[PDB]
């Protein structure tokens, strides 16, 4: 039986990371997609675990050869990152569940290159919930905050493009629904 491939996305700052650690603890053999990158390893990073560290040129080949489900310029083109197709495919073929965490542009991209992946939008339990998180301690300027609220509204409007919507009402219930998606 082919492993399920789930693509997890949502608004920047909806609390995506916290759900991700829950899923990793709750599913022992879950394959968390390890992004390819062209930047250099920081100390303590392991190739094949934190990232697949490949050089700019080899990365360009992979792009050209259709080997990336998604890729993007990082820091305006300082370097690139993306999701390699092969390990996802090899994982699913071995029957292990696969989780890929990306931004909305990345999830959109992956749908085209791998339509059998299940795209999931992690939604806030309400607008006010999200707005409270975005204002947070109010350490940022009005302009920045206005910009964030506008970005949130645009991202939220995208949620219809996704295969599934998971409402982040409660960590454990959000986590639970995702587990149900990943393991058949």
From Swiss-Prot:
* GO molecular function (one): ATP binding
Q: Which UniProt keywords apply?
A: ATP-binding, Cytoplasm, Kinase, Nucleotide-binding, Transferase
The UniProt annotation places ATP binding at: 10-17
Superkingdom, natural source: Bacteria
| Keyword ATP-binding included in the entry's annotation | yes
Against SMART domains, the record matches this protein to: GuKc (SM00072)
Q: Report the protein's function.
A: Essential for recycling GMP and indirectly, cGMP.
Q: What is the name listed in the Swiss-Prot or TrEMBL entry for this protein?
A: Guanylate kinase
Species of origin reads Mycobacterium tuberculosis (strain CDC 1551 / Oshkosh)
